[PDB]
Design a protein around this ligand. Structure first.
Ligand SMILES: [Zn+2]
Length: 307
């Protein structure tokens, strides 16, 4: 792709193609987008965040991360589509324009670059990082069980070979600490969205405790509105609720952490499908998935700008 306009959004890409895409986008919209390097992965790959902004100084912001579980390919694909969409819609869509005129958006397309490279090179179903454990032959940590939110509690595994291993200590994974430091240093995030696949769920905190969050009525109503919006395009049906009541107890998750940091609008999306294809969703479903997910995300951003 020589332009973001010639990039093929209807196919799955490699890490290099995605990183090149970032530079194309910055080159084409220098006034709206910038590429920030917030760290380096365990295997030394740069960890990039795209910042979308119309100006100001430390405007209230929205965090969006995709690909923390490497095999959920639909999420990185949706992330590239979102990046392009932001640049297309600014000045076109009255609602989205209103959002960018007052808030900044930080997008992390490939949150776990080492696992992603591995899914292309050796094992398509790899979901963890690629950090090497001391007293183990097993590699990697489930980065969505490594956050300081009920870390090590039930709903995570203490065995290194487990697909749900939580890691040695909270924030042991550089991929997670890089986000933690950035968000804490910024201090003006209002929303935190983490995108995964699959199951068609929109969840709010918590997963590590049965305790109800103080903002449950509001987040529940936002979730209902977001799922109604998403369903509107293709009729895709999502369920919504707190993590623990919807799925099961799960500790060390990112939205439990972000909520505990005071970022009220903390939600996780589990994208298509419900099991027919699971992690190997056909390339043909990339654009429709991205399109409907954008409506759900925009709904949350609108509430955020207003509240
Ligand atoms: Zn996931």
């Amino acid at each position: 792709a020589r332009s973001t306009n010639t990039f093929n959004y209807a196919t799955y890409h490699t890490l290099d193609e995605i990183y090149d895409f970032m530079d194309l986008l910055v080159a084409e919209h220098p006034q709206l987008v910038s590429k920030l390097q917030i760290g380096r992965s365990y295997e030394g790959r740069p960890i990039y965040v795209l910042k979308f902004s119309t100006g100001g100084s430390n405007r209230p912001a929205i965090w969006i991360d995709l690909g923390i579980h490497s095999r959920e390919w639909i999420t990185q694909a949706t992330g590239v589509w979102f990046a392009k969409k932001f640049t297309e819609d600014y000045g076109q869509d009255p609602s989205f324009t209103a959002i960018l005129d007052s808030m900044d958006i930080f997008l992390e397309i490939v949150t776990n670059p080492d696992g992603f490279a591995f899914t292309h090179s050796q094992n398509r179903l790899w979901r963890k990082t690629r950090s090497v454990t001391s007293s183990s032959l097993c590699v990697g940590v489930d980065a969505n069980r490594n956050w300081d939110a009920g870390f090590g509690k039930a709903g995570a595994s203490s065995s290194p070979c487990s697909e749900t291993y939580h890691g040695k200590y909270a924030n042991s994974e550089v991929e997670v600490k890089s986000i933690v430091d950035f968000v804490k240093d910024h201090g003006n995030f209002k929303a935190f969205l983490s995108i995964h696949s699959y199951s068609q769920l929109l969840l709010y905190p918590y997963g590590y405790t049965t305790q109800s969050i103080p903002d449950k009525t509001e987040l529940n109503q936002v979730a209902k509105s977001a799922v109604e919006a998403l369903k509107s395009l293709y009729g895709t049906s999502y369920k919504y609720g707190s993590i623990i009541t919807t799925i099961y107890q799960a500790s060390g998750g990112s939205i439990d952490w972000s909520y505990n940091q005071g970022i009220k609008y903390s939600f996780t999306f589990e994208l298509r499908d419900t099991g027919r294809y699971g992690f190997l969703l056909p390339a043909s479903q990339i654009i429709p998935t991205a399109q409907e997910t954008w409506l759900g995300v925009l709904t949350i951003m609108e509430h955020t700008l207003n509240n």
